[PDB]
Symmetry: D3
Subunit: 313 residues, 6 copies
């Protein structure tokens, strides 16, 4: 009979991805302005190169200065022969600098449980001192259909990402784009077109599932790194719906993610003014008052606190 | 089973006018309004130190004022507070039979409603209350919307379910301090042009689906900007389109707007009756489908037209 | 488990042409159409008094007409009617093996499909029918959408699921008499100007997710205004974008429109093949990600490309 | 927030079965002392005779005087080609004297829902004035595993029987007997054998499921009609666990079922004395007191009423 | 991925019940050898005396020296008008000496949740320093049918009792006795009768539900307080199945319960010998060995520890 | 649906002979026994310090020894231990194709099995293993029996489920240090005389029901007192009566006992065939029920008789 479980307090404004098969770029990633680093063994690495990428990543975890980055590795999916070797090698060979693993293409709670079972055993066997957190990608029809059970699937779970590329493919969406506006998704009214959000339910359901269970909801990749305004629009929708951050799949997207997912000065100012107004009303024996011609009440305090919390971390 | 979905309560619910229990001067004004439902508030419009006085005010008003034919409801405090049980005990022990309903806020699962039901049922039996209260709830949290159907099925007392956009936004972590309505940062970019979309679509549609499945009235909640009448119309129109049957007024100005939108227009009713006539005429010719104004109407159109008619003849 | 989602039926389902069984004159025209699937109707396009005769007409048509390579389906009456059992018994006892499929309307739970499955299975065994029927259902009620996934997993016979916007709107209590498409009162107001949004988004997306999870074909239902080609294109395009693989035609003119929208454009197919080419080249360079026209493409892009190509090459 | 829903108040001490293919038995069954009559289309009727059995039963429903007896027909199972014809013909051809149908081999709630769907449609189409009630047999591993959902499967459902023959076969029990003691089910203690109840859970779980949902739990066939004392033991176990009656598969078993499932005057006497004792205790301001060296309290009232209710039936 | 959650470590060998309407007995109860005291507001107290009993109990909680007894109160059920008054008065008026509340006739998890909602609110409102634990009674068809969900229903939940009197009534069992042997529940073999356990499933299922979720399973009242040997048999059965204690409804039953539910010196000796034997085997590089002509292995260690654990508390 | 329960594996499973992997001298003796299934143990018969060596021994034994036609299984360590993952990896990366099965102990939910399935499936694919392993599990905890049905349905690989009375007793908190069999303190008192009852009844029956529902073989576990032949026979006889198809042998002597009890006697088979013959004759007379030795036999009796004959003809 308390409120929502609090999610992890750590910053998660941007998760910068890089293929494990390009170790020369690891230093640049560590030096970036991204909160989270995702070294990839999955869909940015060709099958013949996954063994080498695995070796590269283990070496980088043990050898590089990762500063204050939250260090995550995306392993291969449970429908592949690679996943078990990813987990075993990482947990048997990588030092304690590794923070987290990301599980792709999650379709049910049991998927997460399976990884948890293996990871827990190796951590115990090898006497690992820093237990890994988990993050997952909802990027299939099964994933979104079972989104709440997945959100509740492990005490290790800290974050859940939408993967619009795999999601579109799994859903059979007629597009080769990764996130963003869809040309053929619009409303016709009086001869004019009005574009609508083809991702609404997927993103909102993920947010609801995450907040219910104390997980961070995160927006995934936006493919068009040549389109800053397009990225801003996608990030803005996500931030509005309750997602706390977004992937960067290109160095330029890091600043854009940090821009959108850090509340503006004006937003923070209004938030504090609402808090001040409600405190004043409280002293007058009132639980509701008027702010700029609109209603504010006790619920507004919680809303204002959402803004301030994201700005103060 | 093997019948159509359960019919919801047939009472009017176009507008629910809210007022803080700590401002008893508003009570007679609320009683005089054109609102179908009255919600005397003990929760989020009332500061903590004023909750006891508000409870006393409300009980006295339930017993003392002429409430006409309005459906009288009280929003109690949430189950995550120390206030809720005293709200329920005092109301059920001291309020007369003019009280019709209580509103449970921040409902996260069916068991929340069951808990209030258990308490209310016991006191009604102990006091020999002749008019059993109905319940209404607010879906205004991540847990709430995630568990929306089980909540809709949670009690025989349950008559209505409202979306609470303010608490919903806070719960979901939505980057906004507004209450319902258009969100500036929720738009589609297309060829340099912005196209605003509905950031509340799923939540509202899911509430409607859960309610209609289990014979509950789906209702839209507060719209914060009482200076923005067209914004209210837009929000109310979206809700009415999705299947919600009414909307809160948190200011007297909003009652007229709610009644305007949630009462089907003459034009809409006229078309509905024309469609009903068209289908009856088609039925006589041995047809279950026909053409009306260049479009298809069939047996399903009868049910749709009856949705328009029903809300108008109430 | 530990495989990709089950593959849906490989058959074309770009358009399902509907016609009332009480109008046998339409039958040969439907057989001559360009529709992938034919739906002979016993339900909401047929008046109650004509349903018995419509049943007889349809049985004659199944046994007598040249249906070519059309997938032949019959929409029976709902389980909340006295007609449904006579539809199924007569069809399965009297129709020959040309019948491919039965469509069940107004499905609200998995048990509805199980019930029809139980009866159909018994008759097929009793009469030694050589070609067991496939099933398709309509999600067209609040209960249907609330229980969409369990319905999608309800039978090994199930091949397709349609959204029925007319009955869905009526069931949801949506204030409209239109069938699908833009709703005048569903828009966002931003700085004094309106921006229309999709009032069907969740229902459509949830149906697609349910279907793709369980190897079913998600299909868009009727668009009422057969006088509005561009409106049809808009609706069909939204559906195609979300992952639905076809759309009903309730008028001959809509068949060409459906085939057009649900067959990927040459431009779209061209880009897909270019992406596939780019990704193979990247593989050879020891890369699982590369750049295509200023955009990221990776291993997932291969799957997206294959969605386009697969649908174009059928 | 009330007590468990009340089951049907009609007597169900004994259900007398007879094959539909042996219509000479019908008038004898109608003249018996059995509360319920079950005319059989299923496992007592060979496949080639089922169509004629169906015709015989319809004739008997419409032509015989069944007095005050509750008239039921056991149809064929949902895994057979026969069931649909059974239901269609019964509801389209039989008059309103038919009270009930028994569905065999029920494995899940959806099985009962399927029959309900068909039955409801025909009753509406033909304007039948007396809607049928349902009863089912739990006689498979799936049946007992899903016993509660089956008990809640239909507002038509009035009774649930255990079918020990099919249950044994389904469970793979090493026996060819029908109910009763099993020679190989005993406890060995210091060289002595003590026979135990191999049907305990199945019977108890059926009672629990039924009472939870307002259904009558009933014991099924006892095969050895040459063994009166064996029948008595089986019937007594069932009555003790809470089952309200038992099948008769031979005329001799009817009197035995009525004997066991009608509470003895001794039992009724004790119950009334306990009831009187509790009333006297309440007058003294006591909720508990002593009866024959035993504790009795407010719970004892409910127990005594269980006895009396079945006696005044 | 650990062992099942440990139940509360406190002793619970005997729960001595007494009606709240007889406060003259409270001192005798406090001085008894019972681990837990249950002051009753329910079925041992007549309806008209429930108000006075409530006041009596609140006074006794605040006034009596309860030593080290675990102090619990059985409130009225959720299907009565009394329950809310019991809870409100107890939590608003009784001091911090109260340890626990017993909820009778529980039929689902939501029942426990309902009481938890009320209790939690009052504790917060009144600033109660010691949060109450909960215990419940499984004593209805719905209760046993939903026994696992009930066991998982609240973090407060510490114990679950079988209530054989209400259970028998709810199930429609033909008896007026409370627990123990049932005359009509026996197996007939070669003209000889062999009595079996009519309570087996109910008791075993309660134990399983409790041990799964870290709850103590407890046996309920035995009615015939004139029958020491009958009590011993009932207690021995419960102890064998895994119940950790039993109600006393008469002073004489306290010593009996303590006798049976404290492992005998012989039993403890064998346990320690098995532990010693297994330690010796481990030193020889063995995980299994022979003890008194039988197999003992790693599992035997856990079994021996069950014995020792109960003896050492 | 609409078919009888799924058939379990047809292979013999009358006895599963266990032996610790840390005693390789036993291996050839086990291979020469009359047991249908062999269980090489890495778990509770092997001390923690000896588990690595046991693993090496067993892998070498799988590849090196002639196991004839016996079904070869290995019991791995539990998912609550650090050993289990190394057990599975080494077995699947190093053992040849002679390995048939692995046994998972202390299973508490379906997800436990799914977890092992996930790991096993990946290694089989990575190594191109030609014969996919089957799974068997042990129900030997409170959670295990509480969730027995979901566990039985947890994997397509699952072929058998055993009751583990030692761990079950410990988990349930049973006051005993014995393994299976009569419990001295579990009896009914009646008129001064004691009558011992089955303290394992529900656990065994529920396991049988879960298995038969989902086409799994239910098996009885270890009986600890190998000095007590009649105790074993009694325990095995109870299990065979409830529907379990075999039993563990934890000592060579027990193999003969298990085969004795779990092979139907000639008397039992003769009666079964006589009943089948009687029912055949009844069918010819136009009867579905008749009399056999003063008792009723009908169509259900045919299935019962077939249960006896089937176990005899393995
Ligand atoms: C999109 C991508 C393929 C483009 O690669 P590219 O053609 O070499 O990119 P650019 O030329 O525009 O890179 C600009 C600079 O940033 C570096 N850079 C490229 N990708 C980087 C990354 N992911 N992280 C950090 N630095 C990166 C480049 O090496 C180059 O450095 P320089 O200035 O010293 O020359 C590349 O950014 C990439 O691999 N993306 C991440 C893919 C991934 O991990 N996807 C996850 C699944 S969606
Ligand atoms: C109980 C146990 C420790 C007794 O060992 P023991 O003292 O050597 O047994 P015995 O001396 O009576 O054995 C008799 C003979 O059978 C052999 N034997 C013992 N256990 C055997 C087994 N499990 N399989 C095959 N042969 C076995 C012995 O080697 C000996 O053979 P021999 O005549 O050539 O000398 C041993 O049987 C054992 O480990 N059992 C299996 C334990 C197990 O796997 N349990 C896990 C599941 S609960
Ligand atoms: O994982 C991804 O990059 C995706 O599918 O969106
Ligand atoms: O209940 C409310 O006012 C809200 O939070 O929207
Ligand atoms: O089935 C239909 O035509 C509908 O309701 O949309
Ligand atoms: O139905 C029956 O007779 C049975 O199988 O017990
Ligand atoms: O609570 C009790 O005493 C009972 O019903 O057994
Ligand atoms: O696994 C075992 O041997 C047991 O616990 O019975
Ligand atoms: Mg992906
Ligand atoms: Mg609110
Ligand atoms: Mg329709
Ligand atoms: Mg049978
Ligand atoms: Mg009781
Ligand atoms: Mg074990």
């Amino acid at each position: 009979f308390r409120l929502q479980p609090a999610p992890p307090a750590r910053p998660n404004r941007c998760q910068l991805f890089g293929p494990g098969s390009r170790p020369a770029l690891f230093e640049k990633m560590a030096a970036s302005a991204a909160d989270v680093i995702n070294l990839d063994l999955e869909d940015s690495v060709a099958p013949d190169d996954k063994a080498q990428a695995r070796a590269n990543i283990i070496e980088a975890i043990n050898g590089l200065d990762w500063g204050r980055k939250y260090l995550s590795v995306r392993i291969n999916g449970l429908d592949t022969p690679f996943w078990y070797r990813d987990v075993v090698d990482l947990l048997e060979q990588a030092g304690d600098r590794l923070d987290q693993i990301m599980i792709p293409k999650v379709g049910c709670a049991a998927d997460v449980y399976a990884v948890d079972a293996l990871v827990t055993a190796i951590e115990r066997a090898k006497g690992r001192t820093k237990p890994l957190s988990f993050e997952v990608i909802i990027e299939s029809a099964a994933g979104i259909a079972h989104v709440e059970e997945i959100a509740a699937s492990s005490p290790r779970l800290q974050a859940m990402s939408l993967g619009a590329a795999d999601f579109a493919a799994s859903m059979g969406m007629q597009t080769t784009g990764i996130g963003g506006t869809q040309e053929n998704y619009y409303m016709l009214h009086d001869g004019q077109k009005h574009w609508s959000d083809p991702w609404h339910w997927a993103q909102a359901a993920i947010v609801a599932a995450c907040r219910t269970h104390g997980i961070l909801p995160v927006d995934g990749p936006f493919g068009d790194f040549s389109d800053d305004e397009g990225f801003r629009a996608q990030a803005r929708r996500s931030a509005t719906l309750g997602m706390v951050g977004k992937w960067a799949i290109h160095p330029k997207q890091v600043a854009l993610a940090n821009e959108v997912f850090t509340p503006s000065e004006t937003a923070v100012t209004e938030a504090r003014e609402i808090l001040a107004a409600m405190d004043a009303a409280k002293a007058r024996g009132e639980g509701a008052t008027v702010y700029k011609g609109r209603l504010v009440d006790i619920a507004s305090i919680k809303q204002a606190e959402v803004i301030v919390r994201q700005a103060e971390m």
